[PDB]
């Protein structure tokens, strides 16, 4: 699993056209104030262990940043070892649930498999932009 | 070399605090209308060949998108095989020059080694977000 952590002043996205056949999530759109935006690429052989490590790390980083909102944003582009879409969707769902056990604020998982426009205003402090890798 | 191609409606950045010791570029800030934003991670053993492949690909993608502005945005986070900063700066400079030989519009290389805030409004069409890897 490869993550990009962007500490945002604001974030918004809107689903456009699908990028699968039947995307597994409904279309939709959402916008946020200050949040940690976590661009999330599920990799082959990401499993339950990987999910728990990533959840714990997002929680711990969020805690030090003092953010109360985390966006889990499915993203195909951070890796060249992708999990298949069906598995990736499932791991993203589990990540979202595992995060709620570890982090007390708002957790929003964006729709999987839709093309989306988005807008972010990313902070420029030293911890505002970080990458993480998790394996098992 | 690992690239992320974001086809933006608008992009802006502002340098905040440095992230090296003496950053090699001056501080500053800039904003743009529609552009291809190319987040660029220089990897160990990126050389002149790599630069020319990447330049040609950015040019060709830009051409099909019909964009007339390319932002080369130094980015440390897309890879786990980074080139050292001094080499990375040099390759980024060469990429910028090699791009001008291949693409006829505005080329802007953002300051290397500064922390920066930024804002992007990224399009949601099917080619708006792509990743590339180049080696030699
Ligand atoms: N292994 C994986 N990890 C995370 N997300 C994945 C995935 N495989 C498929 N996706 C999702 O399907 C859309 C098209 O591939 C993907 N869409 C996107 O990545 C857009 N935001 C940018 O192109 C994404 O929703
Ligand atoms: N191998 C490499 N490829 C591309 N850029 C590189 C680099 N090594 C160092 N940098 C630059 O130094 C800043 C801190 O590492 C980096 N700053 C950034 O990556 C911020 N935009 C986000 O943290 C970047 O300017």
Author numbering:
A (entry chain A), B (entry chain A): 1 to 136
Quoted passage from the original study:
Both share a striking structural and mechanistic similarity highlighting a common ancestry. While demonstrating that the tRNA provides the catalytic group, we show that the side chains within the recognition site are dispensable for the proofreading function, suggesting a primordial mode of protein- or peptide scaffold-based enzymatic activity evolved alongside that of RNA.
Remarkably, the corresponding mutants Y115A, E129A and Y115A/E129A in ApNTD also retained completely the capability to discriminate between seryl and threonyl substrates. While E129A mutant also showed a loosening of interactions upon L-Thr3AA binding as observed in the case of wild type, no such loosening was observed in the case of Y115A, thus providing a rationale for rejecting the cognate substrate in the mutants.
